[PDB]
Structure formats: structure tokens, C-alpha cells
């Protein structure tokens, strides 16, 4: 029932998370940077795009 | 309500607090620095996420 909640096709995710994950998929990525980027992405998803900190975090990710 | 039952749950309670609590739990650490970090955590929670001072406080706590 948690899953069965406002399907709406789940459109416009922007796959920025997945985009960066794939970009790093090919490279041999150390664990340290892995956890660092996981924390950064958790923060970013936990921030709205309007926030300037959101843009700063996205630049850090890039 | 996806935030409800974990999910994102951003801004419900400073996520850094419990993370650093468990990070410091194992360490044998002097008396005053507990109250120091408690003060820092109270400030961080009272500081908005977007504010640059909040990020500086998080960096100092790191």
C-alpha cells in the first residue's frame, strides 16, 4: 500500500541521480568517494531545487 | 507522507545530529565537549538548511 500510492506514472524524475551513477559506473571508483557522493546525493534529494545550496551541491556533484 | 515512514523526512529533525551521535558514541571523549557538541547541534537545528552559516557549522562539526 506504500507502493500503491499516487502512481501517476512517476514522471519527471530527471534521472540526475541515475545519470551520475551511470557516469561513475564505468570508472573504478573507490569506496571513500562512493560514500561521499552517496551522502551528497542524499542531501541533494533532501533539498529543493530552488535552494541555492541545491545548486552548490549539484556543482559539487558535477 | 513519503517523508512519513522515513523516505526523505528532510527537516523533520536534523539528520546530522544522530549520525554524529553514533559516530562519537564509541569514542572515549571528555566531559565539556559533549555540551559543546550539544550546543553546536542545537544551533544547527536552529539554523536553516539553506543558510551558509548552517553549512559552515556542519563543516566545523565534521
Curated annotation (Swiss-Prot), chains A, B:
Cell compartment(s), UniProt: Mitochondrion matrix
Membership in a protein family: Belongs to the peptidase S16 family.
Organism (species): Homo sapiens
Domain notes: The Lon N-terminal domains are crucial for the overall structure of the protein, maintaining it in a conformation allowing its proper functioning. The AP-domain (ATP-binding and proteolytic domains) has a closed-ring conformation in the presence of AMP-PNP and its N-terminal entry gate appears closed. Upon ADP binding, it switches to a lock-washer conformation and its N-terminal gate opens.
Illness association: CODAS syndrome: A rare syndrome characterized by the combination of cerebral, ocular, dental, auricular, and skeletal features. These include developmental delay, craniofacial anomalies, cataracts, ptosis, median nasal groove, delayed tooth eruption, hearing loss, short stature, delayed epiphyseal ossification, metaphyseal hip dysplasia, and vertebral coronal clefts.
Annotated protein name in UniProt: Lon protease homolog, mitochondrial
Subunit-level organization: Homohexamer. Organized in a ring with a central cavity. The ATP-binding and proteolytic domains (AP-domain) form a hexameric chamber, while the N-terminal domain is arranged as a trimer of dimers. DNA and RNA binding is stimulated by substrate and inhibited by ATP binding. Interacts with TWNK and mitochondrial DNA polymerase subunit POLG.
Tissues with expression: Duodenum, heart, lung and liver, but not thymus.
Function, as annotated: ATP-dependent serine protease that mediates the selective degradation of misfolded, unassembled or oxidatively damaged polypeptides as well as certain short-lived regulatory proteins in the mitochondrial matrix. Endogenous substrates include mitochondrial steroidogenic acute regulatory (StAR) protein, DELE1, helicase Twinkle (TWNK) and the large ribosomal subunit protein MRPL32/bL32m. MRPL32/bL32m is protected from degradation by LONP1 when it is bound to a nucleic acid (RNA), but TWNK is not. May also have a chaperone function in the assembly of inner membrane protein complexes.
Shown chain mapped onto the complete sequence: 402 to 463 of 959
Upper lineage: Eukaryota, Metazoa, Chordata, Craniata, Vertebrata
Amino acid at each position: 500500500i506504500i507502493k500503491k500510492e499516487l502512481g501517476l506514472e512517476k514522471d519527471d524524475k530527471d534521472a540526475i541521480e541515475e545519470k551520475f551513477r551511470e557516469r561513475l559506473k564505468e570508472l573504478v571508483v573507490p569506496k571513500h568517494v562512493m560514500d561521499v557522493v552517496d551522502e551528497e546525493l542524499s542531501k541533494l534529494g533532501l533539498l529543493d531545487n530552488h535552494s541555492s545550496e541545491f545548486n552548490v551541491t549539484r556543482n559539487y556533484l558535477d
